[PDB]
Amino acid sequence: DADLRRLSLKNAKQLLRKFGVPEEEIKKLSRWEVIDVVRTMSTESVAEHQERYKEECQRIFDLQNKVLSSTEVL
């Protein structure tokens, strides 16, 4: 977070251009918002923890539905 705020708006603008951030966020260029967006993009937690639980539950549930209903002869 330190060096991202050391980026001195202009180089952070060029970095947001490099990552592929849309031109609206580059255009507004409030520097705190820019550095929060570039920290988020360089990251790209409790809503992900429960979503990964739901994803793991859904995968095996769908897999169990497919195997035990299949009429494939093994």
Add this chain to the structure above:
DNA sequence: AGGGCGCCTATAAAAGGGGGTGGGGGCGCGTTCGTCCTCAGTCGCGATCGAACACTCGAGCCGAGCAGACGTGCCTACGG
């Protein structure tokens, strides 16, 4: 209308002031730069609150022991 005369051209020199023109210097103004102030954001430190663990007390459950009661076997006493 035309000859003679006045004036222009050229040459030297001075004297002094006045006027004209070009260049430089001085003055004043505006612009630019630097510094300071203010706001926002971030990090560090201290205090307070919540959670987790440990200790203590009590209650319940299980096991063991003893006592009571009846069967059965043996011995004695009583009755025929």
